[PDB]
């Protein structure tokens, strides 16, 4: 239970440092090392998550099946949203990069306030999507 959550906590913790938008971060954001790192922590989060739904499908033994072609389908889509949020976080920082590249490495505050807007929206939706899951990973298991 608490391992795909830890991989997620490593994605969020790194994103947390990118949300600081420090001089350090902005210099980093003009390279491909921050978006490459985000994909790793995401492809780890999804790996630990995909291997954990399988881990439940083993000890999950009650198997009421008229509604379980609805159950797992609701959760196979509710993990589809988590990988979606983490892909979006990565893309929002690809757009920031391509935007400052058209400004010759420069970066306005109108852009950084706009990026901070999207990062906050994503952090919230990320946590909330992971909440709608961890609860739905206790109706599965219980």
């Amino acid at each position: 239970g608490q391992r795909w959550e830890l991989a997620l906590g490593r994605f969020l913790e790194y994103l947390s440092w990118v949300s600081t938008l420090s001089e350090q971060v902005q210099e980093e954001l003009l390279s491909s090392q921050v978006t490459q790192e985000l994909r790793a922590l995401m492809d780890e989060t999804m790996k630990e998550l995909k291997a954990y739904k399988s881990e439940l499908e083993e000890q999950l033994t009650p198997v009421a099946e008229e509604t379980r072609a609805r159950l797992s389908k609701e959760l196979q889509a509710a993990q589809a949203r988590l990988g979606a949020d983490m892909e979006d976080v990565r893309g929002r920082l690809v757009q920031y990069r391509g935007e400052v590249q058209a400004m010759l490495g420069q970066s306005t505050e109108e852009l950084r306030v706009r990026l901070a807007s999207h990062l906050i929206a994503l952090q919230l939706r990320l946590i909330g999507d992971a909440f709608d899951l961890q609860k739905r990973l206790a109706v599965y298991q219980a």
Partner: protein, 139 residues
């Protein structure tokens, strides 16, 4: 009807945690705890209204709209409405920390109607508000 009250007490409560306070109760309680579980995943490996934006009295309606759109861009679930409540709270405590507060009443009327108009429809489909307490209650 309901949603006006739910916002009132949730904003009420979000002042307390920042050394502040200004102007079926199992719903209000469960939502209060949900926002706490939610927020100590937030401020756990994050920081507060620290990942902030440039918030003036004139841009607050714009940042509220930008964030709330992207929050529900691709569907609605209960975990995101908690974020919507958490975000609305993050608005109000950034206000008094940045020297605004009648904004809070605006933010308060920027959450109610949005539940009333564009969220009320999804609420009754997945079981109404009493469905939220049934899924987040005895947990």
């Amino acid at each position: 009807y309901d949603n006006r009250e739910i916002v009132m007490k949730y904003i009420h409560y979000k002042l307390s945690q920042r050394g502040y306070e200004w102007d079926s109760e199992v719903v209000h309680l469960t939502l209060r705890q949900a926002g706490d579980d939610f927020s100590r995943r937030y401020r756990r490996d994050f920081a507060e209204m620290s990942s902030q934006l440039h918030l003036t009295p004139f841009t607050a309606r714009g940042r509220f709209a930008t964030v709330v759109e992207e929050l529900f861009r691709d569907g609605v679930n209960w975990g995101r409405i908690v974020a919507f409540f958490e975000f609305g709270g993050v608005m109000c405590v950034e206000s008094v920390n940045r020297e605004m507060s009648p904004l809070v009443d605006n933010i308060a009327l920027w959450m109610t109607e949005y539940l009333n108009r564009h969220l009320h429809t999804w609420i009754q489909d997945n079981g109404g508000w009493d469905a939220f307490v049934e899924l987040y209650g005895p947990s």
